[PDB]
């Protein structure tokens, strides 16, 4: 029969581990770094563009920061292609919730469904897991600003500051060294840029190799706003934080 070529992507190791999940994480470890820092008045998402060129069109590019809702966004680390299949089902789940309840989907609810989908490939189907880890940055009126992270295993947790992808150990330590609860958005923005700047495997941290997004509640309005920075925007903020 076919049993001969079956990798059995869904079994336990003698140590009670899930090979595929493990290996998929190993894959994610070589993915561009992404950090999520949650301040008191907003949230910040920043990621490093893996592999770039003089010819790469950056104004049209987006390989790590995706808008799911109007109040929820995600930073990706892993297989972009895999990420999209999941990103799209999330955008739909978001809309269904709205259509049914006539209210915006609570950040955690969207996160749990997405993580349940991953968990599935982990327990049945003989299919490989999604080589992806997410940092969800959203806001709702039941918990306000929230920062979540989910990985191939289908598990998710909340964070004040967190990073995924490559050099996470280094990034986490640096964050764990300078993060303060009373932080402000711009503070977070700086801590963010600086952390990357120190974990980067590249020479310097230029704007063309970055993606930036913030979820703030512009006082002169009263509504939370998502802003995914444009190349010229990242370039400015880059000079200001003193990285020129």
């Amino acid at each position: 029969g076919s049993r001969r070529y079956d990798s059995r992507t869904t079994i336990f190791s003698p140590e009670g581990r899930l090979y595929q999940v493990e290996y998929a994480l190993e894959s994610i470890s070589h993915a561009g770094t992404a950090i999520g820092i949650m301040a008191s008045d907003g949230i910040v998402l920043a990621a490093e563009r893996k592999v770039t060129s003089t010819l790469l069109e950056q104004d049209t590019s987006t390989e790590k920061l995706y808008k799911l809702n109007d109040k929820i966004a995600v930073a990706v680390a892993g297989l972009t292609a895999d990420a999209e299949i999941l990103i799209n089902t999330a955008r739909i789940h978001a809309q269904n919730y709205l259509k049914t309840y006539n209210e915006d989907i609570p950040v955690e609810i969207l996160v749990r469904r997405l993580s349940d989908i991953k968990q599935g490939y982990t327990q049945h189907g003989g299919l490989r897991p999604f080589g992806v880890s997410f940092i969800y940055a959203g806001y709702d009126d039941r918990y306000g600003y929230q920062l979540y992270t989910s990985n191939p295993s289908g598990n998710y947790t909340g964070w004040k500051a967190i990073s995924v992808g490559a050099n996470t150990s280094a990034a986490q330590t640096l964050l764990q060294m300078d993060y303060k609860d009373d932080m402000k958005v711009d503070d977070a923005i700086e801590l963010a840029l600086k952390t990357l700047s120190k974990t980067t495997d590249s020479s310097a941290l230029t704007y063309d190799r970055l993606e930036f997004a913030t979820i703030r509640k512009g006082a002169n309005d009263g509504e939370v706003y998502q802003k995914i920075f444009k190349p010229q925007e990242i370039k400015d903020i880059l000079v200001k934080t003193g990285i020129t």
Binding site: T100, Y101, E103, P106
Partner: protein
């Protein structure tokens, strides 16, 4: 039909519902409660076809309780009413539709306001100060159109109700065996066990 009335005053919603259950020639019961609590601050009255009526209400109940447990949070009335309108709008175009009309009354602990929703078996939903299903509306809407004020107190509202129940016993053909009243407010849902002479 049965008597299903609903009135939203200043800080609460009042639901009146006939206690009679007649089957053909005989009135089988005079103490029937045509209502289900969906959550600590959301009550739903219903009237319609013999089986559909309860099966739908309980089904809707089970789902809202499940959402509460799963989210450890209580869905706003508005949201609960949207879930219900959806369920009926599905039912209307299904194989054997639910013939049930409902009134949904709840207190939004976040907005700190009472809300009343009227939804029919077609999935028609509308928000109102006061509403009713069946023929009841026919004699009570003009009463309320006349004597209703948004800032009325629960007491004032309970009187306006007694006024309606009176007109209904006077002009309506059927003996509906009185009504069961319930109040929904910031503190929850309680029944006015003394209206049979209030």
């Amino acid at each position: 039909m049965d008597i299903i009335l609903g009135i939203r005053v200043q800080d609460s919603v009042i639901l009146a519902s006939s206690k009679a259950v007649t089957r053909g020639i005989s009135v089988l019961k005079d103490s029937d409660d045509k209502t289900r609590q969906l959550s600590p601050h959301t009550l739903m009255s219903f009237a319609g076809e013999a089986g559909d009526t309860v099966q739908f209400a309980e089904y809707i109940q089970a789902n809202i309780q499940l959402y509460s447990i799963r989210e450890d949070y209580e869905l706003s009335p508005q949201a609960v009413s949207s879930f219900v309108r959806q369920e009926l709008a599905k039912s209307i175009r299904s194989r054997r539709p639910y013939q049930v009309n409902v009134l949904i009354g709840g207190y939004d602990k976040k907005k700190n306001k009472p809300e009343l929703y009227q939804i029919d078996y077609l999935g028609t939903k509308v928000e109102l100060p006061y509403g009713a299903h069946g023929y009841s509306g026919f004699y009570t809407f003009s009463l309320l159109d006349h004597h209703y004020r948004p800032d009325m107190t629960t007491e004032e509202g309970l009187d306006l109700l007694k006024l309606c129940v009176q007109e209904l016993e006077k002009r309506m053909p059927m003996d509906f065996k009185g009504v069961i009243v319930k109040i929904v407010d910031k503190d929850g849902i309680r029944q006015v066990d003394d209206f049979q002479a209030q």
